[model samples]
Target chain A: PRNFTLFTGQWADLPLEEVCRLARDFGYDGLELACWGDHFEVDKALADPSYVDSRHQLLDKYGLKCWAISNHLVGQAVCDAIIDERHEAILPARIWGDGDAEGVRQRAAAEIKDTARAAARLGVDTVIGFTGSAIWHLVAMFPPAPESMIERGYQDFADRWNPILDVFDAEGVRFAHEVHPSEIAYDYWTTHRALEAVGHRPAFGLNFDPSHFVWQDLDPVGFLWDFRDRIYHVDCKEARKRLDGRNGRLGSHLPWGDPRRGWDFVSAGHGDVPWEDVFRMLRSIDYQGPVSVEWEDAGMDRLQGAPEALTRLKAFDFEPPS
Target chain B: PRNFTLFTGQWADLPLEEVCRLARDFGYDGLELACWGDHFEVDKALADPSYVDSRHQLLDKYGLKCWAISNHLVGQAVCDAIIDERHEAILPARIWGDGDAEGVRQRAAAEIKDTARAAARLGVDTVIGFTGSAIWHLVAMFPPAPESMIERGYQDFADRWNPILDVFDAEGVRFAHEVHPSEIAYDYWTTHRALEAVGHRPAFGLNFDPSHFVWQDLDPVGFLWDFRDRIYHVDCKEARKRLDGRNGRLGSHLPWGDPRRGWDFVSAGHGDVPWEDVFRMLRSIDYQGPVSVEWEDAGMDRLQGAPEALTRLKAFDFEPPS
Candidate 1:
């Protein structure tokens, strides 16, 4: 089976192309281009064919592959702002919600079609982003009220996701949802429920990252067996217990980047999730895909994190036909 | 509906007279003598006037009542340990292996009966201890395995617990399982699986403690609704997450003791469990049991933890029926 390539993404202003070249040098096959709009947006027309060729050609030069296109989806409020033509030009927040879900869906479908066309040119099959739940929603952040909230929200989400799903299906691409906390699919089962309700469209799958599982005490290896069919992308990262230990210990209040302590999303092999088990489980499931070294560890130097991530992936890329 | 008074094994180490006095003074309506054979075991032969008077006088003094009789079933393993005789005192490192299971069952049942007769004299209805998963076979301090390993051990536990169940049934007492990570029923569903296998017998239920729920990120109130009918006891402890940000970068470890670094187990209302939700859920489920406190906050002084716990409970305590 062909394997997806790992490329860590950071903001474009922060030495992205240089980072990509380094990733190529480190045996990463491709770049999971962070869609920060400024660095790389489909809407922008570019004259820098050399810049494009230089980045892609460097990968081609190294025989690395670009596996996927990654971006943070616009929030519903921002989506409305984009559509309503009245708000500020800049995207203020990274999180998107279900407020103007339909309009966002339509725009995302069109944008994703463009994204797919671009990714296809670069040779990748998916775009990974988030489905933002309500701001206040925590741990399986389903919408509140009107009774049967889960059912109502699922129906709404399915309707909104339909447009994007159709576009991905047409483009022969998958739209991978990170089973992140504060999202509808808070954990594996909840993810399964959402996917099941969404009719298990081929376009819909998971970006398997395990830090979310750490806080939930969800056995990620078990999840691999349980949801093997729905996984499209894999993320290689390390996590520790959110201090306080699980089962009603106070939740870490620090934001993801707070650094001193908040379940520090650490370098690969730094936290408790047995990477060996994760690697073995990925292998057992024939997960011949890029275990991309996604970077979120706050304490480490940013320059070091990407290279270190790529290095770890190369070190442990042990998925064989088992 | 009559309420029963209970105390944990921690109380056993108190001076006998002091233990009796404290149980009574603390408004415990009854006693579940911690059956540590090395210490507080009350065999029929030693059921003396002082002991009987201690029980009666405590009940009379505090209007307290005994709820259950619990005994730590095993001390240091003896020959013919639960796994294998040669493996006696040394269990086969893992939970699933089939070994001297029947021996364990027989011994555990005998111990329960011995304690039950004493409990019956005092009119208690439960026998709480352990499932003896890792306890039957101590290796690393924790019961090994990342949760998926619990099934075989629990299956073995069910096999072992059935005879004990029979004994408890015979004694007209219920068996309340503490939801601890090291034991079977570590989580709501895991616990439910074993209990349901026991036919959801009234004689077997949970001693619901929210600290475990807090650390595990579970909703304590939701659990009450789900397990309302079978919940036999409750533990009220507050959990607060730790955060420190005076430094450049924040830390995200769950500091067990620091008032600010991690989740602090304080008296009820001091932590974050929605006591109102708990009360409402309990009422909704028609649970009419004392909200007992299991204080293990290493940060707070034990003397302080006790008084504070009691004070918090009094504040959150259900007001007399309108």
Candidate 2:
């Protein structure tokens, strides 16, 4: 595979160095740094002043290039957005600010900017995340966004993000607003509205994940084709809409983890997402990046199943490289 | 089974005469008339000269008097109380009038007053319904009473409803508010506040349902004991918290009919609600109205299961058929 590759370890049995060693051992060519703050920061090597090349040096040592960088930090972003006095929605993150719109927006921008710098240093081109405001707690998005407030929010998103856009523009990075269903920019229309008001700069793009769009009644393959130039990164994952009956029927009330649930993130090839079409669309969009597998399925062994993602990637005709 | 005898049937299946006949044939001591726009008409019966006595004559024929009367109309009343406009939360009923608080108040008060009179005449003292507002749609609520919006709504509520209360006092009727988790008069404090602001009339009381409280993390039994005097009606229903993995992880968004993905409102026995406790509380409260069964469990074969509710309900003791 030329365009798709395993970005992390098969499992967490080995250290980051061993990860790169095995990446080359398995015939994978590129890596997407998997960093989860506190649990998987991995020496903070990406942020270390000296490790700028220390990261590349290790990648070079194993003939690996840090192709993409990402982290699971929805909670952290929520708190920061609150403190910054912005009204960006937050998530499973502990809320740190009064429920104020400006606080949320400000905090989100601050966090995004800091992340932009950190991601650039890590030699990654894409930074993906959510704009939190609890989807279920949407009822609590009190003082319901008045017409003026929505207008102000549009202005605020543009004003607050313009500075961040400058940072990304300067850093040669792509700020892919992940279209995670149930987030602020979940589907196409809301994402479009947000992007339109915020000035769809070249650096602003999408981290295309078909799983989200599949459950939400969206077409990720077509979306990539439509927003072809805006494609910054791609996730090599799939979603299995749960068959246990109480899936989308609960709609928004039942949380994602409900056992009597339907729809879950799955390892590649274990879900409804058309991996072949996804790859073809990614290739057609000229997305010259690693097809990083995001392993979030609770039902499967997240450790054992993810590394095998590349094997399936090799089967697709639109293979990028591995 | 002496005090437990009750009949189960669709509100649509029988006219008043047939409804009375089924109750008599089934050896039911009482029944709940869960009325909606087309299921039965409040105004039609009230306006038709013979409708009132015919209802009485049928009850006399079956030796069954009024059971609890449930409506999707109360919601319209509360919305009219808030916006005081002719806003139709339920069709062919009342609605929010132009932003004119008094007009809405007068119109809703007239409707409620008329309906309550009809309810009283039919020998049913309590009227159960949603406190109007397109809750899932309109999203506007009586912002916590302390919130400015609630205060504003109280003014409208009082303006439109005080006259209606005067009618209730004269007619000896009770407007039972479903202390629903999401409805305006949901919690004790909010309900208390609205009732108190309007003079703490006994005419305004509660139609208690524990299923709502369970999902909202409230103890329905404890709530009933604490506010026993305020409860004018009891619903024989139950709910199960959806498995946490399905919804956004919260039990808020389940639709009415989802078998695998929602809070299944099965025949009282299918959920986590303590029906024994619910029954005990109702007995203790000296609840006079029917321990109504409001079925929304679309999973069941209604024909096969509707009469099953009557048999199952035989376990609860009521006022021994008056």
Candidate 3:
């Protein structure tokens, strides 16, 4: 059976101790720790060996283990063309500095390298995060955005992240880029371009999260089979598409849990992600990584969804055919 | 594109005119009218010609058509071993004339035969319904139920439903029994047993609704393929499983919206049913029928889901590869 774990990003507001205790009570075997909210603070991990030791002890107290650490916040600014107030809001004071766009991007780049080193010291080789896209705002190709601009966006991603990957390789760690909207790789074709951008390096594979695919009209199972070798980690997040011809797929600026939205993220097994098909494909690929539940249903409470998701996912678990 | 429609079983409280008005606005091409709520009244249909004429005129007023009529309420009393208050609550006054269990069952059986006659008169060839199981109470095999008793159960179902199906054959109407819990054929193997019990008659077929399959751990796609020839209608209802080892699959005597229950019927795209996989298989079998949406999520408003489900389902529509 696969190791069932919870992604701590949604539970970031809670103290790490409480989060670990809840994860343990929720029947999660372990957690995929997020970098924000003092859950897996990169600065503390690098500055104090004792702080890293305390994290291990805390998880041990809850009888939980760690597989990967995520830094989506820092990763989102690494390749973004414009680091706006949104970036300043999420970035640390040291990274934000004087709010200089180029300086922020450079600082974000440096922080991600430190994120990899911290993960190595913490004994987790996988650093799961995003690679912000310079071309995402031009997704619709409005105002006659050219293919050359899109081409340059991938090139920018490669130039920015290749050096970061070198540091990851130095620490003997891997960076699993989550293919999501606003990231360099949102759908099947862009995922291909992202791999090609990084020259399909071993250190830069994918974090298979099917939530973003269902609404994009991309086949999650097909992508899993096609990128079977590059699937470095898995996150069980689900998105339900409500493309009723009235609700736009681009969401129409609606908030989460609103009935007017074209799509919204729901708890795993509660949305459009086909658990049976996904599990069958994962088995076919012999995926032997942590299967983490990233619960994010705005309508449903986390206390219920965080636990229920693991139970629903485990029902699909089966032994190898051999 | 496949014809999108609403199963009026959930809207039985409204008048046929009001339901039609709402369905038209909801983007439905037709209605799978239920027997109750004056949607397709059997008694009125047999008593007067103007009533049937009026139904067509009213539906035509909303630019809608009818594909099938459902009589689940009357059908539930046909073979149910115990005709208690539960049947009285849902069955018609005529069907529950004497409240005597045997008499109630007999009247319900006779009424279903008339239901077939009514459907034929209305120019609909298919009648969707249920076959109440004599053994549903023994779903747990409590007190160590014998195999002989289980065998007797299926026999009783055939003995009761075969004669009813005879009327269906005579009237040139096909009966599509919704394979749901409390029915003679709930899961995969029982579906086979039920078919064998009825001698695999063409007049008797399945109403494939994947909502019932997800909770049973049965593969809905596999069922569709195995019973390809028998799928007379398809209802796009979905169920999400909340079986976190604490919630029991038996439902723990909890209500539908209660989180303590092991599973629930959510909106079509909001649950575990793989809509794309289902649509793909439906295409492989070359199924030509109205795809109906049966909306029953307790938490979400129907005004949103009724329209939203059709939109979500249409996203998976594709031309079959020849």
Q: DockQ for each of the predicted structures, in order?
A: 0.04, 0.04, 0.02
DockQ-based class of model 2: incorrect
Query: For model 3, how many clashes?
Result: 0
Clashing pairs in 3: none
Candidate 1 CA-lDDT value: 0.55
Candidate 2 residue lDDT tens string, B84-162: 1123333333435454655554565566777777777676677776554322221211010123444555565566556
DockQ for candidate 3, please give it. Answer: 0.02
Ranking by lDDT: 3, 2, 1
What is the DockQ (computed on Cα atoms) for candidate 2?
A: 0.04
* lDDT measured at residue A156 in model 3 versus the true structure, 0 to 100: 94
- Candidate 2 regions exceeding 4 Å error are A1-322, B1-10, B13-27, B35-40, B61-63, B80-89, B93-106, B133-146, B153-159, B248-254, B259-262, B318-322
Count clashing pairs, candidate 2: 67
Which candidate, 2 or 3, has the higher TM-score? Answer: 3
Q: Candidate 3 residues B1-322, lDDT tens each?
A: 7887799999999998899989999999999999998788999998897888888999999999999999989998998998889999999898898799989989999999999999989999999999898999898766889899999999999999899999999999999999999999999999999999999999999899999788788878778878999999999997888889999887888888999989988887789997755775687687899998899998789999888888888766643322
Q: After superposition, how far is residue A267 of candidate 2 from its true place, in Å?
A: 34
